[PDB]
Design an enzyme around this catalytic site. Structure first.
Site, PDB file in Angstrom:
ATOM      1  N   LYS A  98       2.739  10.207   8.494  1.00 14.02           N
ATOM      2  CA  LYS A  98       2.092   9.685   9.721  1.00 14.02           C
ATOM      3  C   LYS A  98       2.758  10.215  10.992  1.00 14.02           C
ATOM      4  O   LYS A  98       2.525  11.343  11.370  1.00 14.02           O
ATOM      5  CB  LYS A  98       2.041   8.158   9.713  1.00 14.02           C
ATOM      6  CG  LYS A  98       1.189   7.619   8.572  1.00 14.02           C
ATOM      7  CD  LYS A  98       0.605   6.278   8.943  1.00 14.02           C
ATOM      8  CE  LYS A  98      -0.381   5.859   7.874  1.00 14.02           C
ATOM      9  NZ  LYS A  98      -1.553   5.151   8.421  1.00 14.02           N
ATOM     10  N   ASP A 101       9.231   2.939   1.161  1.00 16.23           N
ATOM     11  CA  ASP A 101       8.055   3.605   1.712  1.00 16.23           C
ATOM     12  C   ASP A 101       8.029   3.356   3.221  1.00 16.23           C
ATOM     13  O   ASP A 101       7.632   2.289   3.668  1.00 16.23           O
ATOM     14  CB  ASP A 101       6.792   3.063   1.019  1.00 16.23           C
ATOM     15  CG  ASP A 101       5.504   3.693   1.544  1.00 16.23           C
ATOM     16  OD1 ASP A 101       5.549   4.356   2.593  1.00 16.23           O
ATOM     17  OD2 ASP A 101       4.443   3.527   0.890  1.00 16.23           O
ATOM     18  N   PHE A 129       0.838  -1.191   0.000  1.00 21.68           N
ATOM     19  CA  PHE A 129       0.000   0.000   0.000  1.00 21.68           C
ATOM     20  C   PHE A 129       0.874   1.243   0.000  1.00 21.68           C
ATOM     21  O   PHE A 129       1.746   1.402   0.865  1.00 21.68           O
ATOM     22  CB  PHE A 129      -0.947   0.049   1.197  1.00 21.68           C
ATOM     23  CG  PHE A 129      -1.896   1.204   1.135  1.00 21.68           C
ATOM     24  CD1 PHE A 129      -3.045   1.126   0.357  1.00 21.68           C
ATOM     25  CD2 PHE A 129      -1.626   2.386   1.829  1.00 21.68           C
ATOM     26  CE1 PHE A 129      -3.923   2.203   0.266  1.00 21.68           C
ATOM     27  CE2 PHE A 129      -2.505   3.466   1.743  1.00 21.68           C
ATOM     28  CZ  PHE A 129      -3.646   3.367   0.960  1.00 21.68           C
TER      29      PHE A 129
HETATM   30  C1  LIG Z   1       2.922   2.353   3.640  1.00 24.30           C
HETATM   31  C2  LIG Z   1       1.965   3.499   3.340  1.00 24.30           C
HETATM   32  N1  LIG Z   1       2.196   4.223   2.248  1.00 24.30           N
HETATM   33  C3  LIG Z   1       1.424   5.254   1.918  1.00 24.30           C
HETATM   34  C4  LIG Z   1       0.338   5.622   2.694  1.00 24.30           C
HETATM   35  C5  LIG Z   1      -0.457   6.818   2.172  1.00 24.30           C
HETATM   36  O1  LIG Z   1      -0.401   7.864   3.107  1.00 24.30           O
HETATM   37  P1  LIG Z   1      -1.581   8.902   3.177  1.00 24.30           P
HETATM   38  O2  LIG Z   1      -2.847   8.227   3.595  1.00 24.30           O
HETATM   39  O3  LIG Z   1      -1.054  10.026   4.240  1.00 24.30           O
HETATM   40  O4  LIG Z   1      -1.774   9.614   1.826  1.00 24.30           O
HETATM   41  C6  LIG Z   1       0.042   4.894   3.858  1.00 24.30           C
HETATM   42  C7  LIG Z   1      -1.122   5.254   4.783  1.00 24.30           C
HETATM   43  N2  LIG Z   1      -2.455   5.196   4.176  1.00 24.30           N
HETATM   44  C8  LIG Z   1      -3.414   4.475   4.764  1.00 24.30           C
HETATM   45  C9  LIG Z   1      -4.738   4.899   4.697  1.00 24.30           C
HETATM   46  C10 LIG Z   1      -5.735   4.142   5.297  1.00 24.30           C
HETATM   47  C11 LIG Z   1      -5.418   2.968   5.969  1.00 24.30           C
HETATM   48  C12 LIG Z   1      -4.099   2.538   6.034  1.00 24.30           C
HETATM   49  C13 LIG Z   1      -3.757   1.237   6.784  1.00 24.30           C
HETATM   50  O5  LIG Z   1      -2.556   0.903   6.921  1.00 24.30           O
HETATM   51  O6  LIG Z   1      -4.723   0.577   7.223  1.00 24.30           O
HETATM   52  C14 LIG Z   1      -3.100   3.295   5.433  1.00 24.30           C
HETATM   53  C15 LIG Z   1       0.883   3.824   4.176  1.00 24.30           C
HETATM   54  O7  LIG Z   1       0.662   3.156   5.190  1.00 24.30           O
END
Ligand SMILES: Cc1ncc(COP(=O)(O)O)c(CNc2cccc(C(=O)O)c2)c1O
Ligand SMILES: Cc1ncc(COP(=O)(O)O)c(CNc2cccc(C(=O)O)c2)c1O
Ligand code: NA
Ligand code: NA
Lengths: 402, 401
Positions: free
Chosen positions: B249, B220, B135
């Site tokens: 984060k 990442d 992700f």
């Molecule tokens: C590894 C990683 N990379 C990129 C993002 C994107 O970041 P933004 O959301 O600030 O644009 C994320 C975090 N994005 C995200 C959003 C919703 C849930 C989850 C989860 O790990 O359950 C993660 C993340 O965990």
């Protein structure tokens, strides 16, 4: 270990070429650098500080919410988000909203939504997006490809496909490219970057009619021209053309990183749980600050004031042209002002900006031929006169040999 | 009155939020509108790394908030340069760019890897290798680099030249990489993908293959960075230095802020106007991230993360002893995943909901894994209290049998 303009080159990616001075404090429409030099701010950090620097109401919202709750994620909703959503819904065509962090992210949401709505409602092949030369929609690979400036979209590998560009304000060209395989027309009601060019009524109404005919969604990028900038809450309200999706940022949070995507329930319903998302988007801190901002901007008195102030600027710009013969056109709406340089001064916008800064006034460009002004919507009359006199001084210095 | 029904009337239906609405947080405790008290082991998905309204972060927010929020990147600003210097001093980085979200930081990293290849090698050197279940964000480009087709399908033509292979499969990466490859993008620990950590052999291997093919290794660390693993960044634990790193984060302890970190050589591929941001790198975000960094980057806080992990792990073990629910406890530092045994496969959400009823906020990492991502300074007392609440929740779920 003092911090200087040289420090920038040692620390930050070389994607910006910052001014030789570093602003460290702001109050209203004034800014001071490290040396204590005072600048009148007609730039607004590029139309962002719509209520100036450290407006007491915005500082109060920031501090009060800052003591309470900053972030809980979209595993949850929060009171400031729902309050802000209600306000946007009450004041606009919107029935549903999504909050994000930047204009780019709001546009990403808008474009994905238009794509997905077409996929689910009509056909997975209904993918064409029509956009306009000189458009600016953000810096992500998708949004910069929808943007109409190849210099910014070249050089990053394969671009997301099915984006067609035609000239802004050319309705015939839009008619020519649109079809049943078209999912969206994306337009800035005033192209802010592209020379401060306003859509004509016939053009904008025509986009609405063509989107109706082809079952495509009309997307208005009001990142720059929304949230009071034009002297209406959103530019679409001036035109009386209602889009399907609208994006907002910049002024929305008065300087706080926040943005919003606005649409109807019917269109919002094409998204399901997990279709889109954001870690930070719609956090209670951003939404408290944007709420305070909204409450000030969306008042009859502030909106009227934007027109009063526009004419105060315009009168100075005319006086400068009478003295120095430098402008061919003064355009825009409300407190988005463009002043196009005469052919004699083609390509000189950056030079007038530089001279302005030397003279203690911050201005913008809108391409190499256009001066741009995007001050606080509540900029004081005294600041307008003082800053425009500094600008007239800068112009005088620049054109001394001409 | 603002209720859970209000969400359905107001926000795009992309979330299914809990029936309760948090209104206040202090440290690792949260209160909803009914005044119900929760222990927070979710951290808003590993974001509130110093808990809610940490005094140092509130102080920084207020101090910069009364000084200057935003001037645009027509100017630099002291907080951005201060924070940049801190990141440079503490990491492999020589240059940084600030943005507003993890998605934006990854966009910057991926465009930079692409552009660096174009200008330093060939416009045809475009392949990006990424991993199943990855992700990387929600933009069209980042969700296409992400390894979950469910999230990238249905938005029209995807940006091309992205190849996915299994996480931890070094052979598969060797097989797909060539002189036309510009990047390998990887989460050192896949957070959303079941809390799966890279093996040392896999990560060191990625470094070697990137060196061989003149590709850039992009970590990442949006989720696993800024102290989450008990080192400032996970790459430091592994001893594998990437070419580009992304952080978000925890970086701002709740404030929307992110960073892309790289070397001067790579940074120099960008020219003026190659990328940018309205809000990215504003003095307010950078002041808050500076205060966060100053706290997280201390021997005591980083040592504490490991002490605290073991406190959580021991409770999770006690829960498995009583209830026979976990097949594996994994992750690093205060990113914890507890995989459910076959009998409970697919029911992570059930335990999450029972948790909330019992007054503890937890996460999932897919349907088979419970995830914990508390404040890095969560108090021992709160760990014990939240874990006893979680035990009550597990008891209730098991009792329905
Ligand atoms: C590894 C990683 N990379 C990129 C993002 C994107 O970041 P933004 O959301 O600030 O644009 C994320 C975090 N994005 C995200 C959003 C919703 C849930 C989850 C989860 O790990 O359950 C993660 C993340 O965990
Ligand atoms: C019309 C428009 N659309 C999208 C964006 C993207 O917003 P973010 O930057 O928050 O992601 C913008 C603003 N983006 C932007 C960035 C730099 C300069 C300028 C300028 O108008 O000179 C505009 C914009 O002006
Ligand atoms: Na409405
Ligand atoms: Na370094």
């Amino acid at each position: 270990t003092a911090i200087t303009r040289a420090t920038f080159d040692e620390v930050i990616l070389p994607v910006y070429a910052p001014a030789d001075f570093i602003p460290v404090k702001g109050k209203g429409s004034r800014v001071w650098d490290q040396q204590g030099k005072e600048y009148i701010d007609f730039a607004g950090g590029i139309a962002v500080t719509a209520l100036g620097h450290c407006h007491p109401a915005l500082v109060e919202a920031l501090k009060s919410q800052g003591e309470t709750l900053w972030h809980t994620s979209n595993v949850f909703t929060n009171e400031p988000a729902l309050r802000l959503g209600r306000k946007l819904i009450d004041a606009t065509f919107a029935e549903r909203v999504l909050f994000m962090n930047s204009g780019t992210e709001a546009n990403e949401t808008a474009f994905k939504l238009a794509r997905h709505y077409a996929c689910v409602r009509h056909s997975p092949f209904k993918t064409k997006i029509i956009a306009f030369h000189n458009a600016f929609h953000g810096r992500s690979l998708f949004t910069v490809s929808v943007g109409g400036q190849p210099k910014y979209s070249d050089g990053f590998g394969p671009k997301p496909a099915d984006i067609i560009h035609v000239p802004f304000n050319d309705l015939h060209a839009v008619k020519a490219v649109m079809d049943d395989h078209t999912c969206a027309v994306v337009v800035e009601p005033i192209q802010g970057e592209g020379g401060v060019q306003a859509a004509t009524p016939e053009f904008l109404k025509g986009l609405r009619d063509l989107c109706d005919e082809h079952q495509a969604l009309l997307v208005f990028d009001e990142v720059q021209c929304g949230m009071g900038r034009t002297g209406d809450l959103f530019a679409y309200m001036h035109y009386g053309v209602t889009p399907d999706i609208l994006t907002s940022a910049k002024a929305l949070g008065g300087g706080f990183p926040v943005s919003a995507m606005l649409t109807t329930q019917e269109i919002a319903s094409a998204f399901h749980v997990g279709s889109h998302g954001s870690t930070y988007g719609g956090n209670p801190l951003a939404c408290a600050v944007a709420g305070a901002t909204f409450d000030i901007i969306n008042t009859p008195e502030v909106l009227q004031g934007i027109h009063t102030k526009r004419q105060q600027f315009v009168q100075h710009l005319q006086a400068i042209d009478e003295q120095f013969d430098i402008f061919s056109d003064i355009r825009g709406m409300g407190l988005l002002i463009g002043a196009e340089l005469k052919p004699k001064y083609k390509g000189r916008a950056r030079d007038f900006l530089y001279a302005g800064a030397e003279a203690g006034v911050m201005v913008l460009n809108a391409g190499a031929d256009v001066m741009r002004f995007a001050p606080s919507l509540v900029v004081e009359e005294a600041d307008i006169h003082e800053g425009m006199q500094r600008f007239a001084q800068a112009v005088g210095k620049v054109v001394a040999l001409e």
